[PDB]
Each structure stands twice: as C-alpha cells, then as structure tokens.
Symmetry: C3
Subunit: 288 residues, 3 copies
Amino acid sequence: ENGYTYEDYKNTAEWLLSHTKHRPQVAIICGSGLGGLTDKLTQAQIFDYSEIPNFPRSTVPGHAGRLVFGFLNGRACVMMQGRFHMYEGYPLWKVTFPVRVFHLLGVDTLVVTNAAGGLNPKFEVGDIMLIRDHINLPGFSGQNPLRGPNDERFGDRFPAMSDAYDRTMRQRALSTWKQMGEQRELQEGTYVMVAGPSFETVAECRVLQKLGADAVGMSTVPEVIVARHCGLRVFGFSLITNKVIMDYESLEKANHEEVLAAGKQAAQKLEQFVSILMASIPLPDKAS
Amino acid sequence: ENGYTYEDYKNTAEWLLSHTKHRPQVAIICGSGLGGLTDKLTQAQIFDYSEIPNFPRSTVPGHAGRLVFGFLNGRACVMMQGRFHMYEGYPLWKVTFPVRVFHLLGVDTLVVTNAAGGLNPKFEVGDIMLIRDHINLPGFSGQNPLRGPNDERFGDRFPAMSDAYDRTMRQRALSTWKQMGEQRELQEGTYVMVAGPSFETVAECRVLQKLGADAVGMSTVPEVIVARHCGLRVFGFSLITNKVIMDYESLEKANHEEVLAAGKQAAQKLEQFVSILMASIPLPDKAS
Amino acid sequence: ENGYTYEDYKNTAEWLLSHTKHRPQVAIICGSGLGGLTDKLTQAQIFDYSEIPNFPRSTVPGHAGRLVFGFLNGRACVMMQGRFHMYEGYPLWKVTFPVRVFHLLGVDTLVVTNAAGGLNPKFEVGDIMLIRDHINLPGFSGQNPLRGPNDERFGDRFPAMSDAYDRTMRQRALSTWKQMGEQRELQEGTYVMVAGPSFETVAECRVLQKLGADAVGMSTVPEVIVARHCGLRVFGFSLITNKVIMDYESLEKANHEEVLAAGKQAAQKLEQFVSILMASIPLPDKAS
Ligand SMILES: Nc1nc2[nH]cnc2c(=O)[nH]1
Ligand SMILES: Nc1nc2[nH]cnc2c(=O)[nH]1
Ligand SMILES: Nc1nc2[nH]cnc2c(=O)[nH]1
C-alpha cells in the first residue's frame, strides 16, 4: 500500500518481464541460511534488488540480497535470496512489495522459508517445521501489510487467513517427506511472528508458548498475508535453528552463531526437500 | 492529539454549532450495517464529513459516511454513519476526532455500536452483545488514541478505563431487553479490538479466546477511550455477525458476505433497541 | 537509531564530558516519585535536558526533567530525573537516547527504577519489586528501540535479552535487603511494559496476569534493551504504587493520586536502598 501505487507494481512487473525471458509460476523466499537454494536453479538470470525499479534495496546485506530467476525441478521459479524484515526499518508495504509484483509477473504459488526458534518442547534444533498456521502479533496491533486503502484489483478489504497455508500442499509435503524415507519426521505447527530484532526473554518465551506458538520468528507472516490477498497458494517451512524457555537456570541465551541449525547439513536438507516439492506444485496448464 | 490542536476541535465544534439549529446530547456511532438507525431520526440535518472542517473524509465510503443530527426517541442526537478505522490508514487521532468535537458540541453520552465475530461459544450469529469491557490489543503496543502530550482541557494524563462501560446504562439496557419481552437474551462480554483488515487464523482465534475475549472487532475501543477521557458516559453493543475457532476442520472461513448477521432483521433489532434506550439515558436537565 | 546518527551520540557525549569534570560509571533512571534520589548526590552538576545537545527535552515536565551528575555512596553517578516515555510522543529512539550517550560517557551499569501497578496478588502497595525479567508487549508488535539498521559499534543485530537483569546484582540486592534487617521482603518478578497512557480495564488486567506479569508499567523496558545491546550491566526495581483485577466489583479504579505508593515514606525506602547498592556495584578498577 502507501508509498506504492498500482502502476508502481505494474512498472516493476513489466520491467522485469521485459528484462527476463523467464515468466515465473513459483516465487520462493529464502530464510536465513536457505539462500543456497539459488544454487539449484538452471538458467538463472540474477537481478540485484537495486537494479529492479521500485524494489526496496537491502539495508546492509545486498550481497546476499538478489532476485534470481530460473527453473527448479520442473517449475519456473523466482527466488528472493535475502528477504526484508520490519526490524530493519522497512515499513511492511516495502517488506511485502515483492509478493505484489510476483503476482503481476504471473506467480500463483509462494513457498516462504524462514529460520525460527523452537517453542514446542518436542522440536530439536535442525528440525523442519511445516507452517500449518500462524499468530500475527504485529498485526493485532496495527502492523498488518494490508493497512491503508484496499486495491480491489489485488484483493478484498477483509481477506480470510484461516485457510492461509494450503492444505493440499501441506499434505503433499508430509507425503514427500515420507516417500524420501526420512528418519526424523517433518514437524508441523503454528509460527508466531514477533518483530523486534533482539531475542526473547524467558518470560516472553513463555507467553508465546502459552499463546499456542510452536516456533517464533520475525518474518514470513507479512508476505503470507499479501500473497493470500492476491489469491496465491502459499506453503512454507521453518528451519528450527534453536530453542529456549527456562528462567529456572537458562544456562545459555543465544545470539546468532547459534542460529545456524546444524548449518549446511540441515539447510541443505530443506533446500532439496523444497526442490523435490516443485514436482508436487500444480502446473497452471491445469494438468488434468 | 498530533495533527490536531484544541482550536481545531474548537473551530469544528463552533462551525457545526453555527451550522445547525441542533445541540446534541447523545452521539451515536453506527457499526457496519447499523447505519439505518439514521432513518429513525426526526428533523435530521445531514452533514457530509467533507463539508465539516477538520473532519476526516472517508477513504472510500463517503456515500455511507455522514454525520446526521436529529431527535431519536426523546433525545437530541448526532449519529456518525460510517466510522473511521485504523485499518484504512487513519492515525488513531483522526479516527477519534469526532468524539473530541462531540464533547465540544455538548454531548455527554456516547453509544458506540459495531459488528464483531463470536469468540464466546455460547454466542449465535445475529446475537447482540452488551460491551461490558474490552481488551485493547493495539494500545498495549503503543496505538492508544491518547498518546502525545495531554490536553488537561479535555482530560487527565492517565485516565482509568476499568469503569469505561457505564454500569447503570448497562443495567438499564439489560432491563429494557427484558421489558421488551425478548426471546433470545441480550448477551454480554468482553470485546477485543484487533487492528489488521484481514480476518483471523484459527491460531489467532484461540489466543483471543484464551485472553478472555468474547467478540473480536476492529473499532470502538479507540473512541471509547477518548470519550471517557472527556468524561462522557459510554455504552455499546456488538452485532455478532459471525464466529470461528477450529483448525480441526474449519469447514468454512468467512470473508464479508458472512458479516451480515442475518442482515436487516438482526440489524433492525439493534437499531430499535438503541432507540428505546434513548428514554433510559439521563437528561442533562438533571431530571430530579 | 533513526533521527540519530553515531556522531550525534558522540557529540552529545563529548559535549557533556567537556562540560563536566565528572566521568560516570553508573547511570540511574528515576521512576515517578523517585527523583529525590538526586538529593543524595555529592558534588552534583545539574544539566537541564534542553542545554544538552541532541537531548530530547521534556514534553511538559522539564522542571522535573534534568540530568544530574555526582557521587552516590562510593560510585560516580549520572541520574536522569524525569525519564521519557513513548506515551508522550517520543519515538523509542529518543526515549532510549540517554542510554546510548551514557555508554559513550563511560557508564557500565544502569539501575532503572519505575512505579508500577501490582498484578501479583501477593504484592501490597508500597512494596518494592526486583525486576528479574520482563515482557515487552510493544516490542512484539514492532516497537523495539533497536529497530532500524544496527550499529555494530554499539552492538549486535540480534542481542539476547534472556539474561537482561544481572543475576549477581539481583543476588547482592536480595542480600542487601536482608543485611538491612528489612521487615517486608524485597519482592521479585516479571515486569510487563504496556504503552498507552490510560490505565487498564479489568479484562486487560487479566491478560497481563495470565501472561505471567507481576507488575505493569509504561517504561524501563526500552532502556533495558538498549543498555544491554551496548553491554551494560542492568538491574532495576519497581515501586508498586497500586494494584487491580476485579470485574466482580472493582469498588475502585485508580487515576494518579493513587500512584503515590505511600509517597515519601515508600519512595525514600527505595532511594536509600538504591544508594546502599552503590557499594555492591563492581568498580571498573577490576577491584581484585
Ligand atoms: N525471535 C526469534 N527469532 C528467531 N529466529 C531464529 N531463532 C529465533 C529465536 O529464538 N527467536
Ligand atoms: N477481526 C474480526 N472482525 C470482525 N468483524 C465481524 N466479524 C469479525 C471477525 O470474525 N473478525
Ligand atoms: N499501566 C499501568 N502503569 C502503572 N504505573 C503505576 N501503576 C500502574 C498501573 O496500574 N498500570
């Protein structure tokens, strides 16, 4: 919304289109440490956020912030390596800008990935959690990417989000995990978005737990919301990079070298899993 | 606050006053589908938000956004048909502007109405819920209409809200429902304001439930707060237009054609009920 | 962050330094009614917020808003009498500005004090609560003082806050309370920051209770967060000035004359307690 006008999304979509032979069907948003997925593309055309018109450039990253087009396991993709977060200063209408243009490019599905902390006791670090639902803490307070006058050309005023995370895709995902003969199971739960850049206190770790959250993070939710408003099929995963909740002798506290989640090894596992699912995402062709 | 200065409220009050023979004692804010209450006025003087000076115009509505003066069942009213919401972009000091000017017009009571979703299991759609209390989610985070320097000419710095919804008015309301010989009872509970324009996920529907909320909505609370700061008697109702909370087979999801709450029929029931209560609201005359 | 640049904190630190013979080791932030602690200083050099460069002046206070340097029970202090709150309009990067400059002055410890309402049933007004942890409601929604690009010269991007309130200092504080032979014990619990200037409804008083909060307030948390990001040892107390949570016959409601907490008497008790603890805060000298 604000700051951006429809023609803005229009000019950015047309520009990209006229600058790439590619026409994407699936946009993929890589979470921290899941950018290597871009290595899995064939015929990649890399665009630096900066080159792309109204596209929000990176506050610091950049060189870990690019939009790369290609083909992944059957599908025509567009991967955003290095996503925007509101903790970096971007208003939510800049953070979710990409999604609006992906819609105008022709994208019909959005797989969003992220790194998150483990709230559910079952979860072990390294785990992967299929996002079945979410709790939008910023949104309850006004920080919803849809705020402002609504463009009925994109969507409705009051979109429902109870059915956000595609049921089929999540079923097919659970099945694909099994068909791969995977040992540690594909977990599943509610992701709670929290804004601030600092990590949580035990007291905070307990309210999110009490609220029903399984993994906590600082992104995804805004993009899921504007994806859905546009009518995109959405599904995502969370790479549990850590976990906490004990005043009673924390013995640790986290920082960032912790948010690696077995680094390469565990990240590679999501990257291939995600690539395997390209086959399981419906062709626009109708494929009947 | 911000954007508005006292003389602004002053000029808007004086202008309206000098433009209307009417001097209101009760301001009524109509929720979605409760604008027909304006049909119940006698000697209506209709002002388009736009004509009124510093008055925030409607982002899209307008022609469902007007301030109409008149008499309703004994009382001298001023009804706002088409209220402002923060999900439309209005900062909370624009959303609650009317209340500040109604105070300067002479208003001493404010009946606020709204449409809300049912969180309490008891509630059936079509129901009416007497607002006994509220949970201000945006306010916990900073989105409180009172934020900014405080004008002691309007009120205190730290107004108490534990006694927001007038006890007497709510008693008289419960009684009036019974005197009307009403079948389905007048429900009563805590209203939780949530900002974002999109509707809630099941996971979100469960935190609001856990927090103690009975009906969820996206307005009222900001206006109740600035009404009280001014010293106005406040009371309101919620037209339960829908209800949800089940990951375990939602089978539905809502949108907006759902938020009708038996449309006309149920809305008419609140509109007359509200008109009947004009008799039950104390005359400034002291009436002793 | 925003609005302020590093050189800004730099110029304000150097200016103060060049304007005071003093070099502080402990910054103390006085809560409502705890400003008399400034009376306990020796060799005080008082600076009006206004005189100090980029320093946010007071929205109304001022004459209850000053930065006074001196010595308190062994330590070289800098006390902020009259702290900034976001309910007054200050963006969180103005509210927490002092802390950033105190860091540049040489401060290594920050004792923050505040007045709060009692959520825990045990607490009696007049009580003092050692802040062992907190729940940052504004931060969950985006209102975190660290938001914006991160200055690695001050700290990391994702600072941990699970270990915010210094364990040792809190142990030494508990001990000092006992060594003083104090009757009513030094309480301890989780402080929940809430923004809005108005006070809470019973319904709101119950969510904070359910969330695990022991005392509710409208400050401290933002400053604790930026203090920690800088690497400062932080510890604080809360003067329980009141308490509520009963729809079922509130019988009272609060306002501000209530937030006195036995005024002088109870405030004096925290002021001396705080002064006694100067001895218990480690000299930068290493003191080995
Ligand atoms: N807020 C938050 N975000 C995370 N991202 C990865 N781990 C965490 C965590 O523990 N907390
Ligand atoms: N947030 C919200 N607002 C509503 N207004 C009417 N129904 C609803 C609902 O289900 N949710
Ligand atoms: N929010 C809030 N702040 C306080 N500060 C002192 N008492 C209170 C209280 O009851 N509520």
